[PDB]
Design an enzyme around this catalytic site. Sequence first.
Site, PDB file in Angstrom:
ATOM      1  N   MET A  39      -5.586 -32.617  64.787  1.00 10.70           N
ATOM      2  CA  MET A  39      -4.799 -33.461  63.914  1.00 10.70           C
ATOM      3  C   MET A  39      -5.541 -34.807  63.753  1.00 10.70           C
ATOM      4  SD  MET A  39      -0.844 -32.524  64.489  1.00 10.70           S
ATOM      5  CE  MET A  39      -0.411 -33.503  65.836  1.00 10.70           C
ATOM      6  N   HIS A  76     -11.425 -37.822  69.821  1.00 12.40           N
ATOM      7  CA  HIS A  76     -11.987 -38.493  71.002  1.00 12.40           C
ATOM      8  C   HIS A  76     -12.767 -37.426  71.793  1.00 12.40           C
ATOM      9  CE1 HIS A  76      -8.956 -36.347  73.205  1.00 12.40           C
ATOM     10  NE2 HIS A  76      -7.970 -36.995  72.610  1.00 12.40           N
ATOM     11  N   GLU A  77     -13.289 -37.776  72.965  1.00  8.03           N
ATOM     12  CA  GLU A  77     -14.101 -36.831  73.723  1.00  8.03           C
ATOM     13  C   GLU A  77     -13.433 -35.527  74.105  1.00  8.03           C
ATOM     14  OE1 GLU A  77     -17.663 -36.591  75.635  1.00  8.03           O
ATOM     15  OE2 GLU A  77     -17.715 -36.856  73.443  1.00  8.03           O
ATOM     16  N   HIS A  82     -11.455 -33.756  72.168  1.00  7.25           N
ATOM     17  CA  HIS A  82     -11.661 -32.914  71.002  1.00  7.25           C
ATOM     18  C   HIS A  82     -13.119 -32.476  70.915  1.00  7.25           C
ATOM     19  CE1 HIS A  82      -8.336 -35.764  69.627  1.00  7.25           C
ATOM     20  NE2 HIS A  82      -7.747 -34.586  69.520  1.00  7.25           N
ATOM     21  N   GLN A  85       5.396 -29.957  62.903  1.00 12.83           N
ATOM     22  CA  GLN A  85       5.564 -30.001  64.338  1.00 12.83           C
ATOM     23  C   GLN A  85       6.108 -31.339  64.810  1.00 12.83           C
ATOM     24  OE1 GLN A  85       1.311 -29.169  64.675  1.00 12.83           O
ATOM     25  NE2 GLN A  85       1.211 -30.519  66.479  1.00 12.83           N
ATOM     26  N   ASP A  99     -13.786 -42.628  61.263  1.00 15.77           N
ATOM     27  CA  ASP A  99     -14.374 -42.411  62.563  1.00 15.77           C
ATOM     28  C   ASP A  99     -14.413 -40.901  62.809  1.00 15.77           C
ATOM     29  OD1 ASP A  99     -14.275 -45.202  62.989  1.00 15.77           O
ATOM     30  OD2 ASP A  99     -12.400 -45.023  64.108  1.00 15.77           O
ATOM     31  N   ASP A 100     -13.349 -40.173  62.440  1.00 21.19           N
ATOM     32  CA  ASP A 100     -13.356 -38.733  62.696  1.00 21.19           C
ATOM     33  C   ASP A 100     -14.566 -38.024  62.069  1.00 21.19           C
ATOM     34  OD1 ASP A 100     -10.920 -39.032  64.056  1.00 21.19           O
ATOM     35  OD2 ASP A 100      -9.746 -38.226  62.376  1.00 21.19           O
ATOM     36  N   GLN A 115     -17.875 -38.873  63.750  1.00 14.86           N
ATOM     37  CA  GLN A 115     -18.083 -38.185  65.013  1.00 14.86           C
ATOM     38  C   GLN A 115     -18.460 -36.734  64.734  1.00 14.86           C
ATOM     39  OE1 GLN A 115     -15.711 -39.462  68.386  1.00 14.86           O
ATOM     40  NE2 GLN A 115     -14.128 -40.071  66.908  1.00 14.86           N
ATOM     41  N   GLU A 152      -7.043 -26.996  77.370  1.00 13.49           N
ATOM     42  CA  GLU A 152      -6.095 -26.705  78.430  1.00 13.49           C
ATOM     43  C   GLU A 152      -5.131 -27.906  78.598  1.00 13.49           C
ATOM     44  OE1 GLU A 152      -7.905 -25.540  82.069  1.00 13.49           O
ATOM     45  OE2 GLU A 152      -8.798 -23.723  81.261  1.00 13.49           O
ATOM     46  N   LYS A 153      -5.504 -29.040  78.015  1.00 15.60           N
ATOM     47  CA  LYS A 153      -4.663 -30.241  78.077  1.00 15.60           C
ATOM     48  C   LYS A 153      -3.268 -29.933  77.566  1.00 15.60           C
ATOM     49  CE  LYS A 153      -3.840 -34.900  77.535  1.00 15.60           C
ATOM     50  NZ  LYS A 153      -2.395 -34.587  77.418  1.00 15.60           N
ATOM     51  N   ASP A 154      -3.181 -29.198  76.470  1.00 14.70           N
ATOM     52  CA  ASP A 154      -1.878 -28.798  75.955  1.00 14.70           C
ATOM     53  C   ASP A 154      -1.764 -27.315  76.348  1.00 14.70           C
ATOM     54  OD1 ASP A 154      -1.136 -31.200  74.235  1.00 14.70           O
ATOM     55  OD2 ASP A 154      -3.174 -30.779  73.645  1.00 14.70           O
ATOM     56  N   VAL A 169     -10.710 -32.649  79.346  1.00 12.54           N
ATOM     57  CA  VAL A 169     -11.661 -33.732  79.500  1.00 12.54           C
ATOM     58  C   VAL A 169     -10.853 -34.902  80.015  1.00 12.54           C
ATOM     59  CG1 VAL A 169     -13.216 -35.330  78.377  1.00 12.54           C
ATOM     60  CG2 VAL A 169     -13.175 -32.961  77.627  1.00 12.54           C
ATOM     61  N   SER A 212      -6.451 -38.447  75.750  1.00 11.38           N
ATOM     62  CA  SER A 212      -5.440 -38.236  74.742  1.00 11.38           C
ATOM     63  C   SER A 212      -5.456 -39.358  73.725  1.00 11.38           C
ATOM     64  CB  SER A 212      -4.065 -38.192  75.412  1.00 11.38           C
ATOM     65  OG  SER A 212      -3.046 -38.304  74.443  1.00 11.38           O
ATOM     66  N   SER A 213      -5.096 -39.013  72.506  1.00 12.66           N
ATOM     67  CA  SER A 213      -5.023 -39.996  71.444  1.00 12.66           C
ATOM     68  C   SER A 213      -3.894 -40.974  71.793  1.00 12.66           C
ATOM     69  CB  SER A 213      -4.771 -39.298  70.087  1.00 12.66           C
ATOM     70  OG  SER A 213      -3.646 -38.424  70.135  1.00 12.66           O
ATOM     71  N   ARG A 214      -2.966 -40.582  72.666  1.00 14.32           N
ATOM     72  CA  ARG A 214      -1.895 -41.515  73.024  1.00 14.32           C
ATOM     73  C   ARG A 214      -2.254 -42.582  74.071  1.00 14.32           C
ATOM     74  NH1 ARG A 214       3.868 -38.117  73.446  1.00 14.32           N
ATOM     75  NH2 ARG A 214       3.940 -37.594  71.212  1.00 14.32           N
TER      76      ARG A 214
HETATM   77  C1  LIG Z   1      -3.092 -27.090  67.212  1.00 20.67           C
HETATM   78  C2  LIG Z   1      -2.752 -28.315  66.255  1.00 20.67           C
HETATM   79  C3  LIG Z   1      -4.042 -28.858  65.556  1.00 20.67           C
HETATM   80  C4  LIG Z   1      -1.743 -27.806  65.201  1.00 20.67           C
HETATM   81  O1  LIG Z   1      -1.344 -28.854  64.319  1.00 20.67           O
HETATM   82  C5  LIG Z   1      -1.986 -29.460  67.060  1.00 20.67           C
HETATM   83  O2  LIG Z   1      -0.804 -28.926  67.764  1.00 20.67           O
HETATM   84  C6  LIG Z   1      -2.883 -30.116  68.107  1.00 20.67           C
HETATM   85  O3  LIG Z   1      -2.891 -29.652  69.336  1.00 20.67           O
HETATM   86  O4  LIG Z   1      -3.825 -31.353  67.837  1.00 20.67           O
HETATM   87  P1  LIG Z   1      -4.630 -32.395  68.664  1.00 20.67           P
HETATM   88  O5  LIG Z   1      -3.663 -33.175  69.395  1.00 20.67           O
HETATM   89  O6  LIG Z   1      -5.506 -33.079  67.676  1.00 20.67           O
HETATM   90  O7  LIG Z   1      -5.513 -31.635  69.803  1.00 20.67           O
HETATM   91  C7  LIG Z   1      -6.259 -30.812  69.180  1.00 20.67           C
HETATM   92  C8  LIG Z   1      -6.859 -29.908  70.254  1.00 20.67           C
HETATM   93  O8  LIG Z   1      -7.669 -30.702  71.179  1.00 20.67           O
HETATM   94  C9  LIG Z   1      -7.271 -30.383  72.509  1.00 20.67           C
HETATM   95  N1  LIG Z   1      -7.357 -31.508  73.382  1.00 20.67           N
HETATM   96  C10 LIG Z   1      -6.761 -32.737  73.335  1.00 20.67           C
HETATM   97  N2  LIG Z   1      -7.034 -33.574  74.298  1.00 20.67           N
HETATM   98  C11 LIG Z   1      -7.894 -32.866  75.077  1.00 20.67           C
HETATM   99  C12 LIG Z   1      -8.582 -33.174  76.287  1.00 20.67           C
HETATM  100  N3  LIG Z   1      -8.458 -34.353  76.900  1.00 20.67           N
HETATM  101  N4  LIG Z   1      -9.411 -32.201  76.844  1.00 20.67           N
HETATM  102  C13 LIG Z   1      -9.571 -30.955  76.241  1.00 20.67           C
HETATM  103  N5  LIG Z   1      -8.944 -30.555  75.052  1.00 20.67           N
HETATM  104  C14 LIG Z   1      -8.120 -31.568  74.533  1.00 20.67           C
HETATM  105  C15 LIG Z   1      -5.827 -29.943  72.407  1.00 20.67           C
HETATM  106  O9  LIG Z   1      -5.339 -29.243  73.566  1.00 20.67           O
HETATM  107  C16 LIG Z   1      -5.814 -29.184  71.141  1.00 20.67           C
HETATM  108  O10 LIG Z   1      -6.236 -27.850  71.312  1.00 20.67           O
HETATM  109 MN   LIG Z   2     -11.786 -47.106  63.809  1.00 20.99          MN
END
Ligand SMILES: CC(C)(CO)[C@@H](O)C(=O)OP(=O)(O)OC[C@H]1O[C@@H](n2cnc3c(N)ncnc32)[C@H](O)[C@@H]1O
Ligand SMILES: [Mn+2]
Lengths: 288, 287
Positions: A38, A42-43, A45, A70, A86-87, A90, A157-159, A185, A194-196
Site C-alpha cells: 500500500m 521502507h526496508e 517492504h 480494508q 519516495d516509493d 526506492q 511475516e510481520k502481518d 525486518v 512499520s509505516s506506523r
Molecule cells: C496485502 C495488501 C497490499 C493488500 O492491500 C495490504 O494488506 C498490506 O499488507 O500492505 P503493506 O502494509 O504495504 O505491507 C505490504 C507487505 O509488506 C510486508 N511488511 C511490512 N512490514 C514488514 C516488515 N517489517 N518486515 C517484513 N515484511 C513487512 C507486509 O507483511 C505485507 O506483506
Molecule cells: Mn518524502
Amino acid sequence: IPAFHPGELNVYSAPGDVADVSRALRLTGRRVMLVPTMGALHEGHLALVRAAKRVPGSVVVVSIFVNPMQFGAGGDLDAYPRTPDDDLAQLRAEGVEIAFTPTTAAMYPDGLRTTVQPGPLAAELEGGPRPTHFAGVLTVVLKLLQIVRPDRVFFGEKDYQQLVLIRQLVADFNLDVAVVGVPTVREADGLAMSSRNRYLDPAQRAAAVALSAALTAAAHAATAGAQAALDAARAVLDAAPGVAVDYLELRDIGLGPMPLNGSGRLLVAARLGTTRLLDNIAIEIGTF
Amino acid sequence: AIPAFHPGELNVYSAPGDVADVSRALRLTGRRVMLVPTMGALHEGHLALVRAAKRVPGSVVVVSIFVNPMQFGAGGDLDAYPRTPDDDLAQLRAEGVEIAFTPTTAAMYPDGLRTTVQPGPLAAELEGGPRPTHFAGVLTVVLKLLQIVRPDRVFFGEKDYQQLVLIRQLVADFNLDVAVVGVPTVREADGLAMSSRNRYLDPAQRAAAVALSAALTAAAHAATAGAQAALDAARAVLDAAPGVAVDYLELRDIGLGPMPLNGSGRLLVAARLGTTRLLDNIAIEIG
Ligand SMILES: CC(C)(CO)[C@@H](O)C(=O)OP(=O)(O)OC[C@H]1O[C@@H](n2cnc3c(N)ncnc32)[C@H](O)[C@@H]1O
Ligand SMILES: [Mn+2]
Ligand SMILES: CC(C)(CO)[C@@H](O)C(=O)OP(=O)(O)OC[C@H]1O[C@@H](n2cnc3c(N)ncnc32)[C@H](O)[C@@H]1O
C-alpha cells in the site's frame, strides 16, 4: 501490449496494461513475481522486493494501492501515509522493473459487489473489532493475483495473520501461485519495521522496543513451557512505560481451530499514544 | 510426469491436480480449453453447451460433473439429486468430449467451507429469495473450477439466467481472464424449458407447465406495445393455467437491474406445480 523497457522501472496504472505486459513476459519465459503493498515503502517492504528479485529469470511487479476496502472508516483511509515519489525512487534503486499503481475507480468500478468472504480466522485477533478488514484484504489480493497472474506472491511475516489468510485464500480457491512468506525486518533494537513507526515520538519510540524484547524473551523462556513464555512476555510489557497491551496470544502456527502443540506463534498488539503496533514471533514449546 | 491424455477419446480425471496439469499441457500444445460446468444427470440442455464449446476451432472440451454441496440449501436435498455417472460419460463419449472432470466432495472441499465467495446483492433476489445462500455456493465452486481448469471460455445456459448474470459479475469483479459464453435455452417441442425436474410432473401438471414458456413468448411479442402490455400478457397466460403457483414474474434490464420502459430486457418467471419448482426467462425488446 503497452511499452515495456527492460532494466528500467515501468509504471502502469491500468489493470489491463499490467495484465498484458505480465502475460507477454510470462509467454516469453520470464517468471513473474508479485509484491503487494500500500506504498509508503521502507526496508520491510524492500526485503520482499529483494526476495522476489533473487528468483532466477524473474520480473518483479510491485503493486502500490491503498485499498479502501480494508479500511474500517474514512478517517483511517485519509490518514494512511502516502509517499509516491519516495516509493518509486526506492523501487528504481532496487532494480524493480514494474510498479502497478491502479486508481480506486479502476479497482472498484462497481463499488462493493462480488467480494471474498474469509473463513473464521478473519473474525479473530486483528479481525475481532474490524469485522470487514480481512475480506477487504483478500478481495483486493485475489484481484491483484488475477490481474498480474504471478508465479509467486510475497508477504511479510510481520502481518502473520494476513499471511495465513492469504495461504487459505490460495488453497481454498485453488489459485495457481506459490505464497512466499518473508521474515520480519527489524530496526537495530528489535522494533519491527512499520509505516506506523513514524507516528511514535522519541519517548514512545524508546518504549516500543518492549514488544520485540517481550517476544524474544518469551521465545527463550518457552523451554520452560507456555505459561513461562507468556508470563515472561507480560513482565516485559508491564515494565514498559506508556504501553497498553491490546492482546498477547500464543497460537498454533496456522492460527486455526487447533490447540497449540509444540510449534506456535506468539502475537502481540499494543498502543503507544494513538499508535497501534503489532509484532509476532515463532515459538517452540519445550524446545531449546 | 503429466497425467496421460489420449486424443479423440473421453479422458476422465477425478483429481483436481490431474485435470489442471493436463489442461495446462494441452493449452501449450495449441488447444483452446473450453469448460462446461455441470452437476451431471445430463440431458439435451447440457449437450447444447457441449456442442457450443466443441465448435470453437482448436477446442478441447472439459466437462465437469460435480454435485456441489455448497449450493444446496439447509433444506435442499443433496442425496436425492440424480446421479447417473455411467450414462453421463456415455453421452459425453457420444459427443466427442475429450475430458470429463469428476472430483469428489473431499477433493473440492479439503478444508470444508472456509474462504468463500460472497455475491453482490442480485444474489438475494429472484431465486435468491427462497435460497439466500444458493448463489454463494454456485460462485464459490465456479471460481474454483475456473482456477483448476483455467479455460479460455466457460459455458453457461441462459436457462439459469440469474446464475449466468452473477457469473459475469464474478468474472468482471475478480478480473478473471476468461470469456463467459451464454447458450440459448433448449426446449421441448411445446416450449417447456428442458430440466430433469419436468419428469416429476403428472399429466395435468405437465400440460399446465406449458404456460410458463407460452406466457413469456406472448410477452415477447406483446412488448411492441410496451412493458406493461408484455407483463399483462404474461400474467394472463399464467392465469389461464390450473395449479401453477407463481412465485415471481419480473421484467428487468439484461443485467437484471431495474425494469426498462424501453430497450432490451429479460422477463423471468418461477412457479410451483405441486412440489416441483420451474423456471423460465426470455429476452424482451420493449417498444
Ligand atoms: C496485502 C495488501 C497490499 C493488500 O492491500 C495490504 O494488506 C498490506 O499488507 O500492505 P503493506 O502494509 O504495504 O505491507 C505490504 C507487505 O509488506 C510486508 N511488511 C511490512 N512490514 C514488514 C516488515 N517489517 N518486515 C517484513 N515484511 C513487512 C507486509 O507483511 C505485507 O506483506
Ligand atoms: Mn518524502
Ligand atoms: C454451474 C454449476 C455446475 C455449479 O455447481 C450448477 O449451478 C449448475 O447450473 O448445473 P446443472 O444443473 O448441471 O446445469 C449445468 C449447465 O447446463 C445449463 N442448462 C441446463 N438445462 C439447460 C437447458 N434446457 N438449456 C440450456 N442450458 C441448460 C445450465 O444453465 C448450466 O449452465
